[PDB]
Design a protein around this ligand. Structure first.
Ligand SMILES: CCCCCCCCCCCCCCCCCC(=O)OC[C@H](COP(=O)([O-])OCC(O)COP(=O)([O-])OC[C@@H](COC(=O)CCCCCCCCCCCCCCCCC)OC(=O)CCCCCCCCCCCCCCCCC)OC(=O)CCCCCCCCCCCCCCCCC
Ligand code: SF4
Ligand code: SF4
Ligand code: SF4
Ligand code: SF4
Ligand code: FES
Ligand SMILES: [Mg+2]
Lengths: 230, 48, 97, 376, 112, 208, 176, 115, 125
């Protein structure tokens, strides 16, 4: 075939050309940590959590965006990859608000879980944190933008899936903010999905606010009947 | 208080005879002690 | 103790020991019920550098047990699970009660 | 029955007052603890071991913590280990007081019970000062201890320990040389070394038959290899020798307590690993990582790497063990509790052969049975 | 000579050298009926020959106890009796044969 | 590594590996696997027919002398064809060592009783029969030990509900304690605690 | 290292034999036991005059539960439900919603005091010091239902014991 | 072949024999149980209940399952004979306090959601 | 020597389960769906067996949730679908088996964000 041979921790994998390092790792049951990457959205490569070491290469690569070359040996659990993950989580948590008890994402937060699995256990940040003002985008999505990690998942979803170009980024540097820049509402038939893709509690469900925690809910797999899509 | 008594007998309370609504000349109990004197009386602090 | 000296002497004679030396009632030798605040030092991982968690991650160094003699797959002296236990020695403090 | 510890149904076939057969019926205190553990996290499962043997609480806590730490591949800090050994010896003092005095009460000497329960009350005060609970401290946790010692606790422990020996002396004056006590205890419930080994006995029930075995000496844990003490050994395998062994074990526990008081080091009290041990409250309210780790340790708990361990300690009643099976999650897959009382009471019929009613009462007293650990 | 062994039910054995020699000879004679290539036969014969050689070369009981590392030759005698009984049982069982059966495919796989 | 990490012991690991090889060589008929864990514990997985020989060998052999039966219990894994895992824990005082012997069975296949090897097994076997329903052949007196009289089912099985099927109360009409189907004023609240992110890469399984 | 407890031989001289015979005939060790009891008779008893005198406690003592407030009177609880998650006995039941001012507060906070094991894990898990185990321990009831605490009962307990609770927390918080 | 180890009986005939011996033992024991426990039922009621408990399992065709059922029944009989059971344990076989739950569709529909 | 039974496994008479909770229960065998709030997939590896949901009602005294069926919290874990089916069949439970859903492989290309003529070109980063 046209498949090429790569290695994940020395294990041989036959992959199609154009496969990224992250996909090749997932072909062997290894999930690379990620924040900005979603398999149904366009690649962004800005969160830098997917950084991984390729053998005989001095610099780590973004596993979500870098196509894997033939013969590459992806070292997913080397010291380089672990230290890169710890550094990226340190930077992510430097300015994050201490809002876990009041955050609806608590218990189902990718930031929490990936800090517990791939980050360190303490903080050496001795400064004051940044705080941003909230945006009103409608009665469905509650917005607390101090928790935002600027993964730009909402922007990509709104632009590509929902077809609405009303979200974006304003400013630059540490003051770059996600929003609409005007008092505008993100009312779309698919808008609520931006709550799901957001890894943090920056975008939460307003009707669901404060009522439950994830561990106490029972999950019933069922079918929607509001339309004929099923 | 009496610091010459051993630990346990060195602090005590003579209860009142008339609490909120009931006659307590004979019917006394430890729940009548208010929280501040409760802390003093149970030796969780050395200060009245 | 507030006992009179004659009753104290009777107690010592009946017990056969000096009772006043070791008393069960602990009048005043005990610590104060109000104490100064502590400072409570921190552990060895409270450092600002050279403190990456991947170098002090005890949970991630656990590994599945080593397999000896799977069935699926000379001199050869006999062995014991460990060297024989050494005979205990009599106490020098008080070998016999 | 005053001698049945409340939950023992001993069905006895008797010829006159001579005991022909003892059939112990247990499970009157079976609460299904081991099945309940499978629905709790490891920290949530910890307080069950307090109620397993409610005469030796911190020893069961220590056994469970050692098993979990072995499975986690972590190390408690040295000060935590010294505190653990100190409070374990205090717990041994409590357990041996209860055993000896309830044994004497069962025979009929009811006076030493009152003398020694004041000492038990003082050690309960120590427990409460260190944890806020008189019995069910939950103080010893995987990773170390919950809180550091309050200021002045060591001085009070020293004050108690410098006087406990005279209380032991008074108890010994009452019981050891009394001819009624020897008539009731000498040559009663004699068990041989080979039978004791084959019947699964441990602790004093072994050492009363001359078997030189102590888990604190042969397979030490925590800082037990840093303290000096003697192991009392019996010669006749009867109730009297086991009574003497327990009294001398109390004296050796006093010796170990003195060494622990004089060798307490400084430092932290739980492992400096926030993925296992919760951070201090000040850090949780200041640092993002500390708050996240507090949240996750108190909601989900820590995941334990998959594997099975059998971890045992020399509890005051014998070898106390846990077979702990972890499937990789934060909830234990299996927890089997090994209690010395189970095997000791299993051999009650064997040790009662050729004896009378009061002899069987004395044998039940000398086996040192608590049914929370027997039934679980 | 020795007043007591210190273990309840374990009697002091007069003439332990003769008893040990008899027991080791019996163990060797029983092992002689086991196949030569059986690991149990060769291992037990090796250790039995070592202990018998130690017994034949030391007339002092305390020094023989120190050499044997077996704990007070009365328990050494008991261990020899246990070994003889086990040898007879093992001759009955024939555990040197190949494996009876393999376990199912995932019988020992953990986790799950 | 340093302070927060439990140290290793290579000497004990090598000794346990050597003794496991020894036992496997001596009894090829029954031994199926030998393992030494990272915290220095030796496990021997045997065929069910070898329960009596292997244990006997571990008790009476001069080089083993595992004279104490510390614990005997069962583990229930419903996904296995042989549901129940029978675990023996043995202590050798002569060599100051511990060993584990593991075998397997299902709901209908009896296991040989070990009371001829260790008397202490008696109650333990009873408990297994009480708690999991595993039958032990040639047990001198096999019956329930922990559960109530007439109790149906085996509560330590994973498919047995936590609160059981019946509960007890005193009924005054019949003037006695009666048993009725369970009703709970507050139902036990199930928690979903497992994180969706992998914790230990060393134990990762093939993707099948 | 070990010692023997019962391995001493009595001397067989005439003096020792006569001493033992006099012990048998005149009951000297029984008189020693009587003397020990008589000595205890004249000692001061260890009894305290309850309820007028109380046993000593600690700032760490775990007693009746209470819900605390900020100095402004606002509730400290924010319905994070950590105490409910950590409770080994499932004694806590919590329901919450946004308040009329948009605040994160509970609408139900019940503790089953006949399910509680009084372990203190809830006050460890609390990040705002909202739920505590107070110093009170004398709250026996006459009916079972009185021991099923709802949010009003716990808030009343906090308002009633705050003076002692704050002092105990001030004494203890540097160990936590 | 299916290579299964027996418990007691090779096939179903010896299993039926063991069932008959257990039934004989229970049938003999019932009057003694009525007298000793001081029960208000008659011997006919107890023997009918024994028959009902035996017929509850009349559909079993596996000799090993039958052997285990006989073992459990012998355990129950040994419990009853030695007065290890109490009157409540024996009377639990009769469900005298539980109200009779209807079987037809309409009554279940009226009462609740259970099928 | 063996006896060679030739009948399918059935242990309903030995488990002590009441009749109502055998013939009236319906167990679902399925690989749980990924929680859409998170990207981790570690909870979608094993098969689960669960029971049908029965009635829960409010307790009159406290408003707590009350249940009457004892199998409401029972969840079993299996490594393969066939193991769960065998367990259900030997325990006498009627079951519905739902096939495992795996996300399909997807063609990801970063350069497609900057296409010369295709619509995949992005207007923002
Ligand atoms: C018959 C002998 C009676 C003589 C006597 O009681 O003297 C006890 C007197 C006090 O002995 P103690 O216990 O060592 O003193 C403890 C404090 O004095 C304890 O002193 P206190 O502070 O408790 O004083 C309270 C006071 C007041 O307490 C009372 O009034 C209640 C007792 C009244 C009993 C009548 O109790 C008394 O001292 C009165 C003595 C009893 C009256 C007779 O002992 C003797 O004088 C020896 C007499 C020979 C005994 C053999
Ligand atoms: S988004 Fe996650 S980490 Fe941030 S406050 Fe909410 S729960 Fe905590
Ligand atoms: S609001 Fe959420 S999805 Fe949007 S950029 Fe911020 S973290 Fe990402
Ligand atoms: S003290 Fe323990 S059992 Fe009681 S409510 Fe708090 S956490 Fe739950
Ligand atoms: S009492 Fe504390 S832990 Fe419990 S819900 Fe309220 S804020 Fe959270
Ligand atoms: S996942 Fe690759 S940089 Fe964010
Ligand atoms: Mg979100």
């Amino acid at each position: 075939s046209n498949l090429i041979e790569v290695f994940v921790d020395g294990q041989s994998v036959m992959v199609e050309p154009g496969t990224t390092v992250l996909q090749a790792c997932e072909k062997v049951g290894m999930q690379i940590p990620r924040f900005c990457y979603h398999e149904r959205l366009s690649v962004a490569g800005n969160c830098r959590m997917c950084l991984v070491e390729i053998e005989k290469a001095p610099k780590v690569v973004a596993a979500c965006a870098m196509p894997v070359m033939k013969g590459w040996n992806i070292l997913t659990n080397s010291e380089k990859s672990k230290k890169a993950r710890e550094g990226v989580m340190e930077f992510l948590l430097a300015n994050h608000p201490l809002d876990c008890p009041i955050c609806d994402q608590g218990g189902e937060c990718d930031l929490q879980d990936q800090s517990m699995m791939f980050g360190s256990d303490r903080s050496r940040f001795l400064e004051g944190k940044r705080a941003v003002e909230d945006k009103n985008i409608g009665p469905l999505v509650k917005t607390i933008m101090t928790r935002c990690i600027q993964c730009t998942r909402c922007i990509r979803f709104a632009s590509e899936i929902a077809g609405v170009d009303d979200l974006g980024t304003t400013g630059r540097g540490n003051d770059m903010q996600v929003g609409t820049y005007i008092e505008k509402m993100f009312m779309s038939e698919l808008s609520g999905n931006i709550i799901d893709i957001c890894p943090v509690g920056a975008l939460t469900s307003k009707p669901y606010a404060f009522t439950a925690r994830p561990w106490e809910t029972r999950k019933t797999e069922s079918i929607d009947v509001m339309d004929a899509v099923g | 208080e009496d610091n010459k008594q051993f630990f346990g007998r060195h602090r005590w309370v003579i209860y009142t005879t008339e609490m909120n609504g009931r006659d307590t000349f004979w019917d006394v109990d430890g729940s009548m002690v208010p929280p501040e004197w409760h802390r003093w009386l149970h030796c969780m602090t050395d200060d009245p | 103790a507030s006992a009179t000296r004659v009753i104290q002497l009777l107690r010592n004679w009946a017990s056969g020991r000096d009772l006043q030396a070791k008393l069960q009632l602990r009048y005043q030798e005990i610590s104060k019920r109000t104490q100064p605040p502590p400072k409570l030092p921190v552990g060895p991982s409270h450092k600002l550098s050279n403190n990456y968690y991947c170098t002090r991650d005890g949970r991630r160094e656990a590994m599945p047990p080593s397999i000896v003699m799977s069935s699926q797959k000379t001199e050869k002296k006999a062995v014991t699970p460990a060297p024989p236990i050494k005979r205990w020695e009599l106490s020098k403090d008080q070998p016999y009660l | 029955h005053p001698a049945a510890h409340g939950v023992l149904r001993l069905v006895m076939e008797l010829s006159g007052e001579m005991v022909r057969k003892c059939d112990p019926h247990i499970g009157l205190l079976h609460r299904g603890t081991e099945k309940l553990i499978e629905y709790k996290t490891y920290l949530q499962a910890l307080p069950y071991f307090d109620r397993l043997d409610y005469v030796s609480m911190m020893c069961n806590e220590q056994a469970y913590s050692l098993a979990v730490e072995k499975l986690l591949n972590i190390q408690p800090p040295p000060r935590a280990q010294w505190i653990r050994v100190l409070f374990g010896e205090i717990t041994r003092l409590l357990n041996h007081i209860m055993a000896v005095t309830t044994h004497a009460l069962d025979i009929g000497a009811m006076t030493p019970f009152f003398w020694m329960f004041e000492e038990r009350e003082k050690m309960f005060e120590f427990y409460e000062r260190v944890s806020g609970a008189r019995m069910h401290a939950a103080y010893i946790r995987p990773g170390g201890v919950h809180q550091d010692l309050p200021l002045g606790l060591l001085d009070d422990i020293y004050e108690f320990s410098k006087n406990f020996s005279f209380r032991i002396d008074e108890l010994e004056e009452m019981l050891t040389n009394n001819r009624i006590w020897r008539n009731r205890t000498v040559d009663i419930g004699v068990v041989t070394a080979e039978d004791a080994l084959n019947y699964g006995f441990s602790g004093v029930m072994l050492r009363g038959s001359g078997i030189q075995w102590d888990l604190r000496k042969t397979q030490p844990y925590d800082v037990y290899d840093q303290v000096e003490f003697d192991v009392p050994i019996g010669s006749r395998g009867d109730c009297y020798d086991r009574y003497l062994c327990r009294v001398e074990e109390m004296r050796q526990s006093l010796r170990i307590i003195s060494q622990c008081l004089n060798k307490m080091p400084p430092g932290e009290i739980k492992v400096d690993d926030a993925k296992v041990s919760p951070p201090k409250r000040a850090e949780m309210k200041t640092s993002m990582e500390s708050l996240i780790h507090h949240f996750k340790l108190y909601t989900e708990g820590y995941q334990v790497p998959p594997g099975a361990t059998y971890t045992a300690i020399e509890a005051p009643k014998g070898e106390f063990g846990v077979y702990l099976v972890s499937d990789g999650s934060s909830r234990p897959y299996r927890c089997k509790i090994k209690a010395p009382g189970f095997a000791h009471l299993a051999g009650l019929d064997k040790m009662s052969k050729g004896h009378m009613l009061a002899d069987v009462v004395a044998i039940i007293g000398t086996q040192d049975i608590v049914f929370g650990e027997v039934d679980r | 000579l020795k007043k007591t062994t210190g273990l309840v039910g374990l009697a002091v054995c007069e003439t332990p050298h003769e008893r040990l020699k008899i027991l080791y000879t019996k163990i060797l004679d029983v092992l002689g009926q086991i196949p030569k290539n059986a690991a149990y036969r060769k291992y037990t014969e090796q250790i039995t020959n070592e202990k018998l050689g130690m017994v034949k070369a030391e007339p002092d009981v305390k020094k023989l106890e120190e050499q044997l590392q077996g704990g007070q030759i009365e328990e050494v005698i008991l261990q020899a009796e246990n070994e003889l009984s086990l040898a007879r049982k093992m001759l009955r069982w024939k555990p040197w044969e190949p494996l009876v059966e393999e376990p199912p495919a995932n019988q020992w796989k953990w986790p799950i | 590594t340093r302070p927060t990490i439990r140290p290793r012991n290579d000497v004990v690991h090598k000794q346990l590996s050597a003794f496991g090889q020894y036992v496997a060589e001596i009894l090829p008929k029954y031994v199926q696997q030998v393992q030494v864990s990272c915290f220095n514990e030796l496990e021997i997985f045997i065929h069910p027919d070898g329960v009596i020989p292997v244990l006997t060998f571990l008790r009476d052999h001069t080089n083993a002398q595992f004279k104490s039966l510390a614990d005997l219990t069962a583990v229930d894994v419903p996904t296995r064809q042989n549901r129940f895992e029978i675990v023996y824990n043995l202590l050798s005082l002569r060599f100051n060592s511990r060993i584990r012997v593991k075998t397997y069975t299902d709901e209908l296949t009896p296991i040989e009783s070990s009371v001829t090897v260790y008397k202490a097994a008696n109650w333990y076997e009873r408990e297994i029969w009480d708690m999991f329903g595993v039958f032990f052949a040639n047990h001198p007196d096999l019956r329930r030990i922990l559960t109530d009289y007439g109790f149906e089912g085996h509560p330590f099985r994973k498919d047995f509900p936590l609160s059981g099927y019946v509960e007890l109360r005193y009924d005054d009409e019949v003037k006695r304690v009666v048993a009725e189907p369970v009703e709970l004023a507050q139902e036990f609240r199930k928690f979903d605690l497992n994180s969706p992110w992998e914790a230990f890469p060393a134990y990762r399984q093939p993707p099948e | 290292t070990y010692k023997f407890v019962n391995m001493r031989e009595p001397s067989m001289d005439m003096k020792s034999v006569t001493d033992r015979a006099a012990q048998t005939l005149l009951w000297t060790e029984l008189v020693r036991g009587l003397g020990m009891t008589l000595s205890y008779l004249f000692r001061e008893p260890a009894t305290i005059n309850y309820p007028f005198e109380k046993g000593p406690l600690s700032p760490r003592f775990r007693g009746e539960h209470a819900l605390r407030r900020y100095p402004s009177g606002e509730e400290r609880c924010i319905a994070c439900k950590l105490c409910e998650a950590v409770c080994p006995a499932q004694a806590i039941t919590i329901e919450a919603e946004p308040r009329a001012d948009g605040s994160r507060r509970t609408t139900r906070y019940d503790i089953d005091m006949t399910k509680c094991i009084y372990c203190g894990f809830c006050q460890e898990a609390c990040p705002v010091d909202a739920i505590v185990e107070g110093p009170n321990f004398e709250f026996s009831t006459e009916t079972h239902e009185e021991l099923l605490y709802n949010k009003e009962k716990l808030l009343n307990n906090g308002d009633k014991w705050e003076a002692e609770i704050a002092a105990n927390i001030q004494a203890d918080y540097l160990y936590r | 072949g299916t290579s299964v180890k027996p418990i007691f009986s090779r096939d179903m005939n010896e299993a039926k024999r063991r069932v008959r011996e257990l039934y004989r033992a229970w049938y003999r024991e019932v009057p003694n149980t009525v007298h000793l426990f001081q029960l208000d039922i008659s011997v006919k009621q107890g023997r009918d209940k024994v028959r009902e408990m035996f017929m509850k399992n009349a559909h079993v065709t596996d000799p090993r399952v039958v052997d285990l059922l006989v073992i459990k029944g012998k355990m129950e009989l040994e419990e009853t004979i030695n007065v290890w059971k109490q009157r409540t344990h024996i009377m639990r076989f009769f469900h005298e306090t539980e109200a009779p739950r209807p079987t037809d569709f309409l009554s279940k529909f009226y009462v609740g959601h259970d099928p | 020597q063996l006896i060679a039974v030739d009948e399918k496994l059935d242990i309903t008479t030995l488990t002590g389960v009441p009749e109502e909770h055998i013939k009236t229960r319906k167990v679902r065998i399925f690989v749980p769906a990924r929680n859409n709030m998170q990207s981790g997939v570690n909870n979608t590896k094993k098969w689960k067996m669960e029971f049908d949901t029965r009635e829960r009602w409010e307790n009159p005294l406290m408003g707590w949730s009350s249940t009457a069926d004892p199998l409401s919290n029972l969840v079993l874990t299996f490594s393969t679908k066939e193991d769960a089916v065998a367990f259900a069949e030997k325990n006498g439970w009627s079951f519905d088996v739902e096939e495992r859903k795996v996300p399909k492989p997807k063609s990801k290309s970063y350069g497609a964000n900057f296409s010369w003529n295709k619509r995949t070109r992005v207007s923002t980063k």
